Amino acid sequence: VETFAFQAEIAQLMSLIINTFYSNKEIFLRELISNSSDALDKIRYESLTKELHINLIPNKQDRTLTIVDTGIGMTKADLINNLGTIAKSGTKAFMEASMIGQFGVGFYSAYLVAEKVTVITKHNDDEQYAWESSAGGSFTVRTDTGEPMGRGTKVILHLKEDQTEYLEERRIKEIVKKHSQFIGYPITLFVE
Numbered sequence: 131v132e133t134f135a136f137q138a139e140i141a142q143l144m145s146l147i148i149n150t151f152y153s154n155k156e157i158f159l160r161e162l163i164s165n166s167s168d169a170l171d172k173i174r175y176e177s178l179t180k181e182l183h184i185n186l187i188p189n190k191q192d193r194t195l196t197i198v199d200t201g202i203g204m205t206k207a208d209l210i211n212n213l214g215t216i217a218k219s220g221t222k223a224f225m226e227a228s229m230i231g232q233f234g235v236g237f238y239s240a241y242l243v244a245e246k247v248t249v250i251t252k253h254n255d256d257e258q259y260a261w262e263s264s265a266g267g268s269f270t271v272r273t274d275t276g277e278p279m280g281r282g283t284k285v286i287l288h289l290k291e292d293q294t295e296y297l298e299e300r301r302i303k304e305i306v307k308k309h310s311q312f313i314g315y316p317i318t319l320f321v322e
């Protein structure tokens with residue numbers, strides 16, 4: 131388990147997301163589905179140079195909403211450096227300007243609804259990694275000794291006690307149909 135500090139910009143952004151009163155918290159899903167779509171586009175665009183989909187797994191017991199994709203995945207180098215550089219440039223752009231995704235920092239909208247976010251990832255020529263952050267100015271990165279998932283990303287949202295609506299079938303179905311209705315990959319909503 132390695133702990134890293136977020137950079138000043140990203141840290142300030144997450145603080146802004148968590149401490150700012152904003153009721154349209156449902157934007158987080160569009161942002162994460164979009165990110166999955168790009169990762170899936172990356173493994174698809176690389177293929178020409180197996181199954182490409184997105185799964186939405188709610189869990190009442192653990193109080194989690196998971197967004198799984200079979201996209202390109204991420205390396206340790208992607209988790210530490212790379213995501214941090216993308217975010218440095220992104221936060222800079224989003225500050226000068228709900229429109230969060232246009233600046234490549236839409237993932238962090240997850241903190242509108244999650245108290246902790248766990249990111250299990252696997253890239254084709256690297257190991258399985260687990261990224262985790264409860265915001266608070268830091269993130270951890272470890273090698274996942276957990277169940278070997280296939281190439282892709284698993285974004286596990288540990289929902290706030292008050293944000294349990296994002297566990298309901300009707301609600302997930304309504305958000306998807308509203309802002310992710312033209313994604314080029316099948317989106318499966320798991321039941322309970």
Ligand SMILES: CCNC(=O)C1(c2ccc3nc(N)nc(C(=O)N4Cc5ccccc5C4)c3c2)CCC1
Pocket residue numbers: 165166168169172199201202203204208209212213216237249261283284
């Ligand atoms: C397609 C273009 N992107 C890439 O190549 C990267 C990449 C590749 C696969 C990805 N898969 C998903 N599902 N999501 C993301 C993502 O943008 N984030 C996940 C995450 C976790 C912690 C903190 C911030 C973020 C933002 C991915 C990013 C390589 C580095 C960016």
